[PDB]
Symmetry: C2
């Protein structure tokens, strides 16, 4: 699994059907663009959840990188992003094979969302809409982009 | 060098003057660019080449077909040492793998000139390198592309 984490003062998620409809809003917290790999195991998912929930990305008083999302009662917007497995090594049309197939990613993703809610709180974890087009207004703070790829652990 | 490429309807880059807008793009790419302590100019070339030609837009009835240049769109290159945020360590990131902020800025700027020489210099927007920015992005998709040159 691959995750791109961005720190936000807020995030607005719309889907279609005046044309766009808002279905998700966080204030301060993280947006996590989440890529599911074909061979991804549950130990991989737990690693994402751990870091998103536990990475200290906020200043507090004198100190920096001192406080994680939970410490400050912040929110989390988890969007699925298979394009993180867009292969671009070979020519310019990106290649998506290594990304887990949709029906299997959905069910995976949902386990992951549930686990987010267990490790933290239902009301703090926003999702979007799986494999549907989205319009996400993201107020980036800093900005701060963290990139983790679980296949780099073991 | 690392790059997070996001596809946007537009992006507004502000700094602390409470905020004041300094940069803006409409449809195009925001690119979060992490410079590595070892990066060569060839590393830069790959990111630049890829950012400009990766065909990340539909051309009605075809998918993944048009790049930023083709559609005459813009790019916002913003510097991100956070991309070598070392997160294996603990719950506190350190960022020692990034280029030290003086050689990084010189490098950055050189990249921007090349982004410019290769596209057309009215379409490359930047931020204030050293500074805190608040950047509102309208993610279009969304579509996030991740490239590390050390994976080649």
């Amino acid at each position: 699994m691959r995750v791109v984490i961005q720190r936000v003062k807020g995030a607005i998620l719309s889907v279609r059907k005046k044309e766009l409809e808002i279905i998700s809003e966080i204030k301060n917290g993280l947006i996590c663009f989440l890529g599911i790999h074909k061979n991804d195991t549950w130990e991989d998912a737990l690693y994402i959840i751990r870091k998103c929930l536990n990475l200290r990305l906020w200043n507090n008083d004198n100190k920096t990188w001192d406080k994680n999302v939970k410490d400050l009662n912040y929110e989390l917007l988890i969007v699925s992003q298979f394009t993180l497995f867009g292969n671009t090594k070979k020519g310019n049309k990106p290649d998506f094979h290594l990304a887990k197939e949709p029906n299997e990613a959905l069910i995976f993703y949902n386990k992951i969302i549930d686990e987010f809610k267990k490790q933290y709180n239902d009301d703090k974890i926003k999702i979007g809409k799986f494999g549907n087009y989205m319009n996400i207004d993201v107020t980036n703070d800093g900005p701060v982009t963290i990139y983790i790829d679980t296949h780099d652990i073991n």
